[PDB]
Amino acid sequence: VPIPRRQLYIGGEWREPVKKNRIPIINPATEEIIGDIPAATAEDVDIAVEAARKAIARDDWGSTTGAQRAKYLRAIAAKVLEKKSVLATLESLDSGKTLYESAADMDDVAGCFEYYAGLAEALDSRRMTPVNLNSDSYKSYVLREPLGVVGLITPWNYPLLMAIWKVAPALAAGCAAILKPSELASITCLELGEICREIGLPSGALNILTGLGPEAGGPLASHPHVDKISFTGSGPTGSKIMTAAAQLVKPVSLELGGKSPIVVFDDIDNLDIAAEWTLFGIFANTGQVCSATSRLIVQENIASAFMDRLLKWTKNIKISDPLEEDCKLGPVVSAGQYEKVLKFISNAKSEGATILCGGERPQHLKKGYYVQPTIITDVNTSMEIWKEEVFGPVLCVKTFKTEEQAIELANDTKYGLGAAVMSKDVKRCERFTKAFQTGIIWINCSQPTFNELPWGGKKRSGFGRDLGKWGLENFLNIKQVTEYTSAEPLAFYKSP
Amino acid sequence: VPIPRRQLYIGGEWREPVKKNRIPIINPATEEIIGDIPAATAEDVDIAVEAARKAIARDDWGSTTGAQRAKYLRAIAAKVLEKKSVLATLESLDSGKTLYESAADMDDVAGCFEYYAGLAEALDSRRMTPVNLNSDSYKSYVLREPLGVVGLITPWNYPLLMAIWKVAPALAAGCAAILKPSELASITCLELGEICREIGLPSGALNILTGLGPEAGGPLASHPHVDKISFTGSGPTGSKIMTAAAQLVKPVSLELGGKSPIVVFDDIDNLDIAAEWTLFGIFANTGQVCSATSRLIVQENIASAFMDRLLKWTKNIKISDPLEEDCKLGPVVSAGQYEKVLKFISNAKSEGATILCGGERPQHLKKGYYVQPTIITDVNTSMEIWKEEVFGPVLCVKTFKTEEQAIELANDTKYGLGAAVMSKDVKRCERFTKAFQTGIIWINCSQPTFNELPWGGKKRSGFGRDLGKWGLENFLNIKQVTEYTSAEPLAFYKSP
Ligand code: NA
Ligand code: NA
């Protein structure tokens, strides 16, 4: 430890919530209350929006160059790397994420800030774009400027990282942001506020409001002076936010869950390498990954041998305290999530499916929301386990003979986030790239991504793209500037 | 004039609606029923979505190249131009649009199809974009593909043109589109269906469902198999569509109304040139223009001189049946609109504003929804006339002394679509380009636009951009494709 105790971060200052409420920090490994966070309400949202509006109107932020904002982004990145070990420890204590994964997230945070710092440095030369028109009387160009005040509502699965995926491009674009992290994992996001204080980030450029979704997130979505909402989390929450934004014809982006498939063909070169990618696609982060490859679709010729290697690798996953450097599986984030995940596993048993491994809590761990990595077989398409996102370390399996059957099973979901194809056959991998009904496709792996690439899905996984140039462009207002250069009258109407 | 009688256009066929309902076509100039149109319901929507999905799955649409789609787009453009006189007369009879304006819309339809045919040819070369990663174990690229099934809900003010702004980029991107034109002006959109049949457009590529908003448009927004909604029309309908789309976390774009300002400075070179641009920005299309410059903000030194020129040009506008030569003003589209527009004028009088000219139906025209071009003065910012979009030939006027007052008045709106500045001062025009809280800025003109330019607004005018590359990109699904090229194991987990 120690566990920080912070207030809300608004207009460059620490501010107590108007209603003075607090909500707890629970360590999911021990189930112990380890501290508390401020619980913001609509009165705090109003203050945060006024502070963000003040930033856009001030020279300190609203009139900065992209080069100037890039300096702030880099200074935040350097303070994150300086505090790396402390922040990774807090990330694990708060979320249950392993220390190794928490440390990888911190490096991804630095990399995300650096990527956007570079784009902010290129931004100003692309501010004004002359446009070719088939006319000599008109002169036109496209002007790109910050969109304004943006609300960023983020999830607990990558507490600081998911916040940065939104924060880094919003600040790079010149927007003033109001970040609303999950009430289940707010420590590192509140530490971002302290970092912004340390680097002298201009007042209102970033405002951090912790609290319950309906009380703190909800008012952002219905606020008259929030220009856009960027959301990552559950589909039912996304629908609520979009419904509230519709009343003010306010744009929103939604990065929602998935039921991503991993398709394993009989021509894979190495069974252990493919089995390891399968474990990674489903058990990493205790399966609390939107893009997790939760449905294994395996070719019948290798199914038996591949399942053997998969089960052997799975039973070798070290489940322990997340702070242990060699921990491979932490607990799920909360009691609510623990109950939800165990209910999915029990419903699968009651529907006729087979628990090939896991499905229980580990024997040596009496406390903590620990769920064993679970492999579910003898699964049919009508089962809840096949259709619904579990958000736990739970993999379900179906076999196939033909490529056509694999595509049909792969696309047999209402979601459309990611998908993976494991095969040595280059033309087959290209066919799957086109056929998978998703926003992300992995070939001979599952999960890796880079800042340079667009991230997002389709169907019930939502819309909009995070990262790459898309992340920044989501935060720009586009203007058409059209000038009449001819000295002649329009000559549409009759002169009096 | 012969009025065509058509059925719904679905899966390459003329199809009767399931419930066999039809609704009248009213000529706004005569108030007479001149024919009828099919009235689609939810069962017709279901058939159109299935036809659209079949097109996506068929090699002759879903597997076409951009060059192949470009050939259909150009064939549609050629057919529109061959039938220009017929289509332009039909557009006037249906909507009340002057024949001269209807003819200009047909030139723009052909031009829009031509611009998108060009973009479709370039699309194949940008289908796969390799992305440089600073990695030795991964290779990634961006894949752009059609978004899928798209619902396009369009308004009556530019019946065919507004349909084409959505249809041309949807077909260029390779989507299968379902067009839902306004029940107030559907003749030309049904004629578009006949043109698609004549040119051999593949079945399901474009489906045209005429009918009432809640009956035919509604099920499109709530359909499980519609990937996106593109809407142009009123803010309240936009809100209802986005609300329905939210339950299925379906993306939408909303192009809504505005209360756009025209700012006139005392350094204008010619009073008559600026006065004609002002008439054009408010009276053309009977003021039924989303981007109309409905608020005149005039510098106090030139106000009296400018208003006198404005009155003289205004009183010179020929109001008559829209098919007549030299008609400069047609009627409003419907009885509902007529009453709404006259109600706004009577409310301004009740608020203490002055009706400088017009404000009534013209004396010489006993039939038709004719409203005289109206100029409203002695307006204050609290008045309904200043705040609300009238969507009629109604200009309201305020004076200013300083640039600071002009900017405050210009941005004193909940809307943010377009804005115009009339001044010879180059640096001032540059300051307004930045200062106007809009998506469109005109310099020394009001209304001109080109296909190469992004069109849309911010604030209550909505979000998303039509036209240019934006129009096309709105209809593409973006895919990240990440491949692991290394023969090495991931080495995250412990081998058994
Ligand atoms: Na926590
Ligand atoms: Na009509």
Curated annotation (Swiss-Prot), chains A, B:
Transmembrane segments: none
Reactions accelerated catalytically: 4-aminobutanal + NAD(+) + H2O = 4-aminobutanoate + NADH + 2 H(+); 3-aminopropanal + NAD(+) + H2O = beta-alanine + NADH + 2 H(+); 4-(trimethylamino)butanal + NAD(+) + H2O = 4-(trimethylamino)butanoate + NADH + 2 H(+); 4-guanidinobutanal + NAD(+) + H2O = 4-guanidinobutanoate + NADH + 2 H(+)
Alphabetized Pfam families for the sequence: Aldedh
Principal EC category: oxidoreductase
Keyword Metal-binding: yes
Pathway, per record: Amine and polyamine biosynthesis; betaine biosynthesis via choline pathway; betaine from betaine aldehyde: step 1/1
Documented EC number(s): 1.2.1.-, 1.2.1.47, 1.2.1.19, 1.2.1.8
Catalytic-site annotation from UniProt: E255 (proton acceptor), C290 (nucleophile)
Binding residue positions for Na(+): I26, D94, L184
Entry-linked PANTHER family: BETAINE ALDEHYDE DEHYDROGENASE (PTHR43860), BETAINE ALDEHYDE DEHYDROGENASE-RELATED (PTHR43860:SF2)
Subunit structure: Forms homodimers.
Protein known as: Aminoaldehyde dehydrogenase 1
The organism of origin for this protein: Solanum lycopersicum (Tomato)
Classification lineage: Eukaryota, Viridiplantae, Streptophyta, Embryophyta, Tracheophyta
Gene name, Swiss-Prot/TrEMBL: AMADH1
